[PDB]
Amino acid sequence: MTNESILESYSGVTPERKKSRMPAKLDWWQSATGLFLGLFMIGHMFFVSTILLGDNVMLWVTKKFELDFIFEGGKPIVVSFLAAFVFAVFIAHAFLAMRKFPINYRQYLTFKTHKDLMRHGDTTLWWIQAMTGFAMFFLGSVHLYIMMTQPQTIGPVSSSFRMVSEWMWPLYLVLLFAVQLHGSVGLYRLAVKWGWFDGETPDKTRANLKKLKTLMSAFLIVLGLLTFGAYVKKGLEQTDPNIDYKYFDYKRTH
Amino acid sequence: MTNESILESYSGVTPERKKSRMPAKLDWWQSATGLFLGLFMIGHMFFVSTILLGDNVMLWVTKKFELDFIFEGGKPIVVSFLAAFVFAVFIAHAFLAMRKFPINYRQYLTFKTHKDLMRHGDTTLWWIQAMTGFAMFFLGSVHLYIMMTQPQTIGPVSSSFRMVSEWMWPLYLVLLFAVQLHGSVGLYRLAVKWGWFDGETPDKTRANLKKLKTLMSAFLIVLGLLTFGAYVKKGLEQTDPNIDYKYFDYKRTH
Amino acid sequence: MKVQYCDSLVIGGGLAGLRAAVATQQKGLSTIVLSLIPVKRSHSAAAQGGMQASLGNSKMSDGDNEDLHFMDTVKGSDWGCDQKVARMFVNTAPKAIRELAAWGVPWTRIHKGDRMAIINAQKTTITEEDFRHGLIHSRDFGGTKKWRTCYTADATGHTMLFAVANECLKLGVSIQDRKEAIALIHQDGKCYGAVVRDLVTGDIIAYVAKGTLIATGGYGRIYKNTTNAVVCEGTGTAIALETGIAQLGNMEAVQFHPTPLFPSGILLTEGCRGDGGILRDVDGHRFMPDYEPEKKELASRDVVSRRMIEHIRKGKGVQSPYGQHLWLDISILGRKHIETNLRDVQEICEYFAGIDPAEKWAPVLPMQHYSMGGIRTDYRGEAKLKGLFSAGEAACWDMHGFNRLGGNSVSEAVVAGMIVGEYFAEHCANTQVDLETKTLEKFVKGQEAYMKSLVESKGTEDVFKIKNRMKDVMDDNVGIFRDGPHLEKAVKELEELYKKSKNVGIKNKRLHANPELEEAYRVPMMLKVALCVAKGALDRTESRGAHNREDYPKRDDINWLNRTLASWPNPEQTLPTLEYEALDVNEMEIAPGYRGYGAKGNYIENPLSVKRQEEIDKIQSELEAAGKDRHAIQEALMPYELPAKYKARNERLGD
Amino acid sequence: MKVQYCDSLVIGGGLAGLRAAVATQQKGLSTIVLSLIPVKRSHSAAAQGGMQASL
Amino acid sequence: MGRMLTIRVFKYDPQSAVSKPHFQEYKIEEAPSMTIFIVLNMIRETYDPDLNFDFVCRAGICGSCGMMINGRPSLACRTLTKDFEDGVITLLPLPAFKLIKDLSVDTGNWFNGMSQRVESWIHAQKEHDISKLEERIEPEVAQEVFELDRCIECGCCIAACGTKIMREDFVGAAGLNRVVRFMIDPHDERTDEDYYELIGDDDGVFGCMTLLACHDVCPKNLPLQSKIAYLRRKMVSVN
Numbered sequence A, B: 001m002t003n004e005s006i007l008e009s010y011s012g013v014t015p016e017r018k019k020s021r022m023p024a025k026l027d028w029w030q031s032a033t034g035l036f037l038g039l040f041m042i043g044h045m046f047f048v049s050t051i052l053l054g055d056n057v058m059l060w061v062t063k064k065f066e067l068d069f070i071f072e073g074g075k076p077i078v079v080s081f082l083a084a085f086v087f088a089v090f091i092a093h094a095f096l097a098m099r100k101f102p103i104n105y106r107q108y109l110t111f112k113t114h115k116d117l118m119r120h121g122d123t124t125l126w127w128i129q130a131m132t133g134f135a136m137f138f139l140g141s142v143h144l145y146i147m148m149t150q151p152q153t154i155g156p157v158s159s160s161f162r163m164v165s166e167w168m169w170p171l172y173l174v175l176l177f178a179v180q181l182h183g184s185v186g187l188y189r190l191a192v193k194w195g196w197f198d199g200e201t202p203d204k205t206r207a208n209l210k211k212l213k214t215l216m217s218a219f220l221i222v223l224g225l226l227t228f229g230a231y232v233k234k235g236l237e238q239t240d241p242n243i244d245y246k247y248f249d250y251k252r253t254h
Numbered sequence C: 001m002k003v004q005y006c007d008s009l010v011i012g013g014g015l016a017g018l019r020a021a022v023a024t025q026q027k028g029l030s031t032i033v034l035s036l037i038p039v040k041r042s043h044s045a046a047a048q049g050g051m052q053a054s055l056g057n058s059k060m061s062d063g064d065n066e067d068l069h070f071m072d073t074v075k076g077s078d079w080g081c082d083q084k085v086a087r088m089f090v091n092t093a094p095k096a097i098r099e100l101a102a103w104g105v106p107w108t109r110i111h112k113g114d115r116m117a118i119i120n121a122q123k124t125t126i127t128e129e130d131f132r133h134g135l136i137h138s139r140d141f142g143g144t145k146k147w148r149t150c151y152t153a154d155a156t157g158h159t160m161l162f163a164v165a166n167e168c169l170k171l172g173v174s175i176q177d178r179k180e181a182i183a184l185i186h187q188d189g190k191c192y193g194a195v196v197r198d199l200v201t202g203d204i205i206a207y208v209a210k211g212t213l214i215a216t217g218g219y220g221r222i223y224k225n226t227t228n229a230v231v232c233e234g235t236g237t238a239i240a241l242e243t244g245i246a247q248l249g250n251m252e253a254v255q256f257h258p259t260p261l262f263p264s265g266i267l268l269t270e271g272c273r274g275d276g277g278i279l280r281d282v283d284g285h286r287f288m289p290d291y292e293p294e295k296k297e298l299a300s301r302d303v304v305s306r307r308m309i310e311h312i313r314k315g316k317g318v319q320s321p322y323g324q325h326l327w328l329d330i331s332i333l334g335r336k337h338i339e340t341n342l343r344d345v346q347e348i349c350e351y352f353a354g355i356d357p358a359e360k361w362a363p364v365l366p367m368q369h370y371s372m373g374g375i376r377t378d379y380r381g382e383a384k385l386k387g388l389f390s391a392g393e394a395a396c397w398d399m400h401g402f403n404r405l406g407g408n409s410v411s412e413a414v415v416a417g418m419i420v421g422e423y424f425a426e427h428c429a430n431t432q433v434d435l436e437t438k439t440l441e442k443f444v445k446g447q448e449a450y451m452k453s454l455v456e457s458k459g460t461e462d463v464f465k466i467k468n469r470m471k472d473v474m475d476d477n478v479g480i481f482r483d484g485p486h487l488e489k490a491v492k493e494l495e496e497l498y499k500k501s502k503n504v505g506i507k508n509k510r511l512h513a514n515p516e517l518e519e520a521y522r523v524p525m526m527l528k529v530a531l532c533v534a535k536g537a538l539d540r541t542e543s544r545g546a547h548n549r550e551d552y553p554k555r556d557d558i559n560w561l562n563r564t565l566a567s568w569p570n571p572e573q574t575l576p577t578l579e580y581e582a583l584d585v586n587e588m589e590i591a592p593g594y595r596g597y598g599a600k601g602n603y604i605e606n607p608l609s610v611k612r613q614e615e616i617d618k619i620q621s622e623l624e625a626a627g628k629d630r631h632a633i634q635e636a637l638m639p640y641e642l643p644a645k646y647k648a649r650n651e652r653l654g655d
Numbered sequence D: 001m002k003v004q005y006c007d008s009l010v011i012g013g014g015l016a017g018l019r020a021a022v023a024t025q026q027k028g029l030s031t032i033v034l035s036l037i038p039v040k041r042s043h044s045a046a047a048q049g050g051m052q053a054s055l
Numbered sequence E: 001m002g003r004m005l006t007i008r009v010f011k012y013d014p015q016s017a018v019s020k021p022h023f024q025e026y027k028i029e030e031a032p033s034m035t036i037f038i039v040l041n042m043i044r045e046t047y048d049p050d051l052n053f054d055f056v057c058r059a060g061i062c063g064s065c066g067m068m069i070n071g072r073p074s075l076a077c078r079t080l081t082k083d084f085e086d087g088v089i090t091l092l093p094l095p096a097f098k099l100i101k102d103l104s105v106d107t108g109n110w111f112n113g114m115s116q117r118v119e120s121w122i123h124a125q126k127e128h129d130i131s132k133l134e135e136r137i138e139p140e141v142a143q144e145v146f147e148l149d150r151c152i153e154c155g156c157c158i159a160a161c162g163t164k165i166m167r168e169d170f171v172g173a174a175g176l177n178r179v180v181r182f183m184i185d186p187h188d189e190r191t192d193e194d195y196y197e198l199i200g201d202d203d204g205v206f207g208c209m210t211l212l213a214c215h216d217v218c219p220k221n222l223p224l225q226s227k228i229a230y231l232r233r234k235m236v237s238v239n
């Protein structure tokens, strides 16, 4: 605590007698972290889906992220730093966005009742945002820690192993719908919240953003389910008890 | 939504014109789930520490939880159900307790400033409760999912593997302090909150509960660190690239 | 006992009351505004035509000034107005517009260029020069040669009301809504406040003040068909009347609007016919040209209403379960025109009539619209009961006489608010009152006893059946056309209705938030108001302005160049007491003559009018020859008063 | 000018003023108690000896 | 005929100790161009004079009759029974406002409080002489101000807002719109920093969660979505 923070806590204003600018900064950062995660996830879905193009394809993509063009067989630790960074933004975002949850019985009851009475699309979608957000506290953390601590186990073979043998598929299936619904709705609300594309016909822009939101979600969900099946199918074929699948892909170029 | 929930949302009272009993029930369940987790953790620390008594010891204890005295070599799936149950209580508790976090800039600033000005033990301890609680959203979820999906990988050998080779030790080290601080403070506040042991000299009872809280924490932290070292040391000795440590303990009695 | 004190008490939160409150509050007088509803929901908010003021900014306003506005007002009133008051008004209207502009009212502005306009005598092109750009615009409204009606697109009353209400909030005026004045506190011929009923809690409270101003609006809801909000019931009028001292002026002077939507009464702006709207009968026949070959659809609103009723009486009306009506066809203007210049009217017909005006015709019928009558005051706005002031539609300051100009009423509300506001402020600051608790207790206890008697009444009459019968009687017998036989019948039935209102019984016994109890005390009040209207109409044997007696078709400047003054001195009497205030032609800047609209030579000339006219022509010529300005000439003809603050002249484009 | 009316005005929020206020308020008289400080902080609060009464 | 309508109304008198919140049903025969205004008055005059509700203009201009009609805050005087293909209409008072009784709530005083909170009036250093020509204003600017000045303080956007329902100190869509209305008025001299001192906090613009229910129910169709975003961009850039 500093003298200034004490003066602000007790007076409600800064030493210059103005309202704190912190609420503004927090609003900015909540949206910034949200935007980062939303875009990151889109790219994430494309890279992880390379499995549909063949093992050699995703294997090649995987080696690039490990800085193949700078290190021998690439260093998996690169992905560890990448994962750590995204984990930090994940936590920062959850911390800031959490401020928006209904926080007591009264708020929960009245909002839930209002949502059901209104049958208003964008209000209902916010509820989904909140629900999926809360769920990811548990689902997302599991995946992020593993990617950060076991980067050398990423590959067309090793990833399929974790998917099936380590029973990660149930978590991935749920997380898939959770993050895609959360992500697309979030990017959409971000657009209308800050009005970056409003222009001269705001209502038309919004109508288009809503359509784009639905298409993006549908496409990414389908692509996500196909990619899911791919990893699952391969994982179900790993029946050789003498083969170390978990570290197979790594045991190719160190 | 039902007619009764609508009437309560709009009037602030039940159809009988009384205040909802839900706040009371939620308070009860928040404490109940907290108590369950607190006690569970104490037992958890003793069973996980059996590694200090020898591999054969914890191995024997591990097989008992898998219902050894009912199934051949015991079924690991038993631990999966156990983990699932605790995970559910974990989530239910976090959901209810979360209602108590400072939820906006003003609340956060004023409480933090108050905590630093007051230098009041029990107030500062609540802050620690909140901080460790938030941190466990990410730390606890990782561990719980794995125990639930890879129960056959629990053992003096397999557990040490995950500890070191799968880099779970950094998470365990932090989670150890987080859950122990959270747990002991929580059990303590639970006692003074409901006053189960107040008696005729409340101030003496509280003074004793605080001492007991510190001792319990110290003891369990030491025991926790020793057990930590044990798993780490063993994990650092698993250098045979031809041995499948992850499923070693399982490959003993199916 | 509950008592609230303030230096200045204002009853009514419309344009007039709020503006008067600004006047008193800005000079340090603690002021309270009482209102039945949140002030921004007052009827003033519904005005869409505009506000009349001689700015002279636009091309069609070029050359306009106080004199032209003054003449349109006087002639429009059919000489029933106090011309000195009309002068105070026209000279102040320009500053009301300008003050409101400074307060943020978004008046539509002029842009340089040509524009496709309808003149209905030469629907040609109008050009606005560069020096007019950015100034307050004006449109054709009220039938005045000079277009001087200012507007904020299609919601003038709304933006004006919000600005004045916001100014009251800025100044810290105490706005107390859901509060109803049910009686005035008075003693020794002086008003000390009002007994107020809190509509929410049911508490009876005495609001005492050094001065009390009533700005409660019109009394149109005594009629079944009206354009007025459901709160325009004239209770403010009634409480003044029930003091037995304050008088009501020209209550029989009621103005109707020709094209309100039938049967709701929701208004379809004058701009419809002004743009080219066509009136059709049961056969789809455009009938106005038959009665008005020249003016046709564009005849005086006063004439259109009469023709519409005549056409219906000839059996050409459209039959409906709600009564007979006619049609308003605006589709002929083209869907394009309608959705760009009449987008508002289109929404009305859809949201309520459930029809697309660009395709189907709207049912219409003339209905009560404005109340020229009201509480009688002197030029300062003070009533016969000392300390009681009135402004806005609730008053009979009488700048309207027997026919208010379209656009002059929202203008009056604000202007009177300013002027009466000054005199009211002066009174409150300089007067000293003797507040006797004995008197306050008598009035408060008297109303608490009244509320109790209503709740305990074992009467068997139904308040709603009585109120609804009153409204039918008013519509059937005291409308556009009146005759002695029917008026006599109306008066007798209203009197009988009044007696029965005293035997009303209500189901809900609670004293708080009780709409049924509210009707129980309001209806008897409305009946006394209705009686003043009907009886005043019966006794006035002449046709003047909006008051048309089929059995006395001529304007009688010999016997009826006066103002009807109604009072109710004895609480036992069942009929109002009527007296007359003669208008002195000697104090008229414009001697009685042809009003401009309607049949010519339809008035019985008064010899004194001719004398005064000659006297006027003489004074003008002489002074005019001596090279004297219009201002000096005006003073010589009829000097008038104005508070110091508003004595200045109005600068115009071109001076 | 600011004016506040009540049937019974009590100046002082100690034992005497508050008890008198109860007397007037219980019979429907609107009453106001004016005090320099919150009434429960009046000097009356310091009495520790007791109250004399022939019980 | 005209089909039979089933009107379900919320009834509760908080000032009466024996009153309990409940629904009451009425059977009304529909008629041509029938509105909730006509329905409620029919009920009052012939079936139940106890029922509280507020109407004034009955023309959708004053903002007096807002209420929840089948889950959506709307103006009762502008709502046609015809639009309910089912014949069942449920009426609730507007949430987020203090309840007076039944369908009557106090929107007026909350709005006056809001108007004071955002200082809803022209802020100018010098008073313009009212006996002189008015200051010139571009017609496009006057039109823009008018667009936002059309708000009738009906409260529908306040009751439609899940954020307001949960957090009562939230200034609401109407309050954010009011700030912009003065922001774009050349007559008002306040700067962005001045406005920040009014709504630059979590109870203000940063408290909006962009649910957009306000925009979708506003009976006057104000451009709330783009105007609130406009304000948010400006307030987040202060300093």
Ligand SMILES: *Cc1cc2c(cc1C)nc1c(=O)[nH]c(=O)nc-1n2C[C@H](O)[C@H](O)[C@H](O)COP(=O)(O)OP(=O)(O)OC[C@H]1O[C@@H](n2cnc3c(N)ncnc32)[C@H](O)[C@@H]1O
Pocket (backbone or CB within 6 Å): C011, C012, C013, C014, C015, C016, C017, C034, C035, C036, C037, C038, C039, C042, C043, C044, C045, C046, C047, C048, C049, C050, C051, C052, C157, C179, C180, C181, C182, C215, C216, C217, C218, C227, C228, C229, C231, C232, C235, C236, C267, C369, C370, C391, C392, C393, C394, C406, C407, C408, C409, C410, C411, C413
């Ligand atoms: C009905 C109408 C009138 C109208 C118009 C359109 C319609 C639909 N268009 C106009 C136009 O374009 N140009 C014009 O010049 N006039 C137009 N008018 C008529 C004009 O709007 C009115 O004459 C004017 O608005 C009247 O203003 P005023 O300030 O006098 O009154 P108000 O707005 O009706 O408000 C009355 C207030 O009194 C309160 N009240 C009433 N009784 C009581 C009691 N007993 N106790 C306490 N308060 C009371 C009302 O609540 C209200 O606030």
Ligand SMILES: *Cc1cc2c(cc1C)nc1c(=O)[nH]c(=O)nc-1n2C[C@H](O)[C@H](O)[C@H](O)COP(=O)(O)OP(=O)(O)OC[C@H]1O[C@@H](n2cnc3c(N)ncnc32)[C@H](O)[C@@H]1O
Pocket (backbone or CB within 6 Å): D011, D012, D013, D014, D015, D016, D017, D034, D035, D036, D037, D038, D039, D042, D043, D044, D045, D046, D047, D048, D049, D050, D051, D052
């Ligand atoms: C000082 C004292 C007195 C005392 C005592 C111990 C102490 C330390 N112990 C007593 C005991 O054991 N037995 C006993 O019989 N008496 C004892 N006393 C004396 C006794 O307490 C006092 O006589 C008694 O309490 C007096 O009561 P009273 O109701 O008269 O007055 P108060 O409590 O002092 O309160 C005065 C109120 O007046 C307000 N005030 C004062 N001036 C103004 C102005 N100008 N305007 C508005 N309000 C005013 C004060 O704020 C207060 O509320």
Ligand code: HEM
Pocket (backbone or CB within 6 Å): A030, A031, A032, A034, A035, A037, A038, A041, A090, A093, A094, A095, A097, A098, A100, A101, A129, A130, A132, A133, A134, A136, A137, A140, A179, A182, A183, A185, A186, A187, A189, A190, A193, E209
């Ligand atoms: C990869 C993971 C995540 C992605 C892609 C993501 C993305 C987004 C986006 C784009 C927004 C819009 C932010 C704004 O409007 O300013 C948003 C909102 C939100 N997110 Fe996330 N999020 C993620 C994880 C989480 C988590 C773990 C939580 C848990 C607390 C969470 C809770 C919320 C909530 C409640 C909102 C609404 C905030 C508001 O209404 O202002 N998010 N998120």
Ligand code: HEM
Pocket (backbone or CB within 6 Å): A044, A048, A079, A082, A083, A084, A086, A090, A136, A140, A143, A144, A147, A153, A154, A155, A158, A159, A160, A162, A163, A168, A172, A173, A175, A176, A179, A223, A224, A225, A227, A228, A229, A231
């Ligand atoms: C830099 C961090 C991340 C990396 C390196 C990464 C990497 C991967 C990889 C390699 C897979 C394939 C399966 C496996 O190997 O186990 C995968 C799947 C998945 N990831 Fe991530 N991920 C990251 C962050 C995230 C985040 C933040 C989320 C959402 C909260 C997420 C959601 C998913 C989902 C749902 C799948 C399943 C894909 C499908 O089946 O369609 N990932 N990720």
Ligand code: HEM
Pocket (backbone or CB within 6 Å): B030, B031, B032, B034, B035, B037, B038, B041, B090, B093, B094, B095, B097, B098, B100, B101, B129, B130, B132, B133, B134, B136, B137, B140, B179, B182, B183, B185, B186, B187, B189, B190, B193
């Ligand atoms: C094994 C894990 C956990 C254990 C042992 C545990 C135990 C406890 C205990 C014993 C209490 C006392 C409850 C009461 O006073 O009624 C408590 C309080 C609390 N816990 Fe946990 N908890 C765990 C995880 C979490 C998580 C994941 C969160 C995250 C939101 C959390 C947040 C809280 C908070 C904020 C409180 C204070 C509640 C209040 O002040 O009423 N806990 N916990």
Ligand code: HEM
Pocket (backbone or CB within 6 Å): B044, B048, B079, B082, B083, B084, B086, B090, B136, B140, B143, B144, B147, B153, B154, B155, B158, B159, B160, B162, B163, B168, B172, B173, B175, B176, B179, B223, B224, B225, B227, B228, B229, B231
């Ligand atoms: C039924 C559920 C649980 C089971 C079956 C379980 C099992 C185990 C096992 C076998 C280990 C040893 C290392 C390993 O095998 O990876 C361990 C360690 C650990 N567990 Fe759990 N656990 C459960 C729940 C929890 C919960 C809820 C927490 C706290 C949120 C927790 C905190 C820890 C910590 C901190 C360690 C490290 C011990 C040390 O190093 O001293 N566990 N657990």
Ligand SMILES: CCCCCCCCCCCCO[C@@H]1O[C@H](CO)[C@@H](O[C@H]2O[C@H](CO)[C@@H](O)[C@H](O)[C@H]2O)[C@H](O)[C@H]1O
Pocket (backbone or CB within 6 Å): A101, A102, A103, A104, A105, A106, A108, A109, A130, A131, A134, B022, B026, B095, B096, B099
């Ligand atoms: C959807 C994710 C929620 C985001 C997290 C933050 C908001 C929710 C937690 C804070 C408010 C506490 O919320 C409180 O939870 C309990 C659940 O035990 C709800 O309880 C009610 O709903 C649950 C779930 O449908 C039912 O099983 C239960 O019978 C019913 O009484 C309370 O009505 C709610 O008010």
Ligand SMILES: CCCCCCCCCCCCO[C@@H]1O[C@H](CO)[C@@H](O[C@H]2O[C@H](CO)[C@@H](O)[C@H](O)[C@H]2O)[C@H](O)[C@H]1O
Pocket (backbone or CB within 6 Å): A022, A026, A095, A096, A099, B101, B102, B103, B104, B105, B106, B108, B109, B130, B131, B134
């Ligand atoms: C400790 C766990 C907290 C429990 C979670 C719920 C309460 C906290 C989140 C809700 C309130 C938001 O809290 C808001 O967070 C930001 C962090 O970016 C703080 O920001 C402030 O502290 C952080 C951390 O010391 C500094 O890096 C930052 O420079 C400073 O301005 C705000 O002062 C706080 O009000």
Ligand code: SF4
Pocket (backbone or CB within 6 Å): E063, E150, E151, E152, E153, E154, E155, E156, E157, E158, E173, E174, E177, E217, E218, E219, E220, E221, E222
């Ligand atoms: S912004 Fe729209 S919904 Fe909100 S108060 Fe104004 S007019 Fe009503």
Ligand code: F3S
Pocket (backbone or CB within 6 Å): E160, E161, E162, E163, E164, E172, E173, E207, E208, E209, E210, E211, E212, E213, E214, E215, E228
């Ligand atoms: S609905 Fe509420 S959350 Fe913001 S977008 Fe409108 S004010």
Ligand code: FES
Pocket (backbone or CB within 6 Å): E054, E055, E056, E057, E058, E059, E060, E061, E062, E063, E064, E065, E066, E075, E076, E077, E078
């Ligand atoms: S009664 Fe005025 S908007 Fe409905």
Ligand code: NA
Pocket (backbone or CB within 6 Å): C371, C372, C373, C374, C392, C393, C394, C395, C396
């Ligand atoms: Na009048």
